[PDB]
Ligand binder design. Structure first.
Ligand SMILES: *C(=O)N1C[C@H](NOS(=O)(=O)O)CC[C@H]1C(N)=O
Length: 250
């Protein structure tokens, strides 16, 4: 465990980072207190909910559809019968809500328990209804389920090193749809953003979680901001994460 200083890449934004290479158990940690603090995963839960849906047969491939019903949404790309790949990349809430609501709560509880997914608390299945957004809510969106950045990395490692019971075919579907382009062909980066606002503490939950492959070595990582500035989003923390990867992990 090496404590490191990534502050320059954070460019004044409050946050922390953890990178882990499980081949040589080297843990690089910036802001240890924050890296161990549990918070809502927000849209980073799509990594796990995709695997749940695949395991239960609700979806089957990166083409799979969830039967769009014509409801009007402000994001143009949500207004279609989009595939799993598109729903993941567009963070389509209705698709992932419909997917998870086809799965019984005990199945979800047991999968989160097996993954050690933070507090594994799905008690508020409906999510944070007091925000007024109704069915555009759930236990993983600023609600009962909470996970620390370190636990995110531990979960990512368990999944992608083949240490869970999820099918290898399903893990490869997730790998494919998580791949991002960082304009450097010598590293393969995979990840997912998440954005929430913690109404209790007046702080954002801005995430980028994923993995980095660079010539035989693999690093599992989680970058997290808790800034009070509502402008700080998942996509913004992904930029920060990419800056760290290019500076320290290339
Ligand atoms: C996920 O955190 N969410 C879904 C959607 N995409 O967020 S992301 O760009 O950080 O991946 C909008 C924000 C949030 C939500 N409100 O559900």
């Amino acid at each position: 465990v090496n404590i490191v200083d990534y502050s320059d890449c954070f460019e004044g934004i409050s946050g922390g980072a953890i990178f882990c290479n499980t081949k040589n158990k080297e843990y690089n940690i910036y802001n240890k207190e924050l890296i161990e603090t549990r918070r809502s995963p927000c849209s980073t839960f799509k990594i796990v909910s995709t695997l749940i849906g695949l395991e239960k047969g609700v979806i089957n491939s990166k083409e799979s559809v969830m039967g769009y019903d014509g409801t009007d949404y402000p994001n143009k790309n949500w207004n279609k019968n989009l595939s799993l790949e598109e729903a993941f990349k567009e963070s389509c809430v209705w698709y992932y809500k419909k997917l998870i609501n086809k799965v019984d709560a005990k199945s979800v509880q047991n999968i989160l328990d097996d993954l050690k997914y933070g507090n594994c608390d799905i008690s508020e299945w409906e999510g944070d209804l007091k925000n007024g957004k109704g069915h555009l809510n759930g236990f993983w969106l600023e609600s009962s389920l909470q996970i620390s950045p370190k636990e995110q990395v531990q979960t990512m490692a368990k999944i992608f090193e083949g240490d869970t019971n999820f099918k290898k075919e399903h893990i490869n579907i997730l790998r494919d749809i998580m791949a991002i382009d960082v304009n450097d062909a010598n590293i393969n980066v995979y990840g997912k953003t998440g954005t929430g606002f913690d109404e209790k503490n007046k702080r954002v939950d801005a995430w980028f979680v994923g993995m980095l492959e660079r010539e035989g070595d693999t690093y599992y990582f989680a970058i997290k901001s808790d800034d009070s500035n509502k402008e700080i989003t998942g996509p913004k923390v992904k930029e920060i994460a990419i800056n760290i990867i290019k500076k320290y992990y290339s």
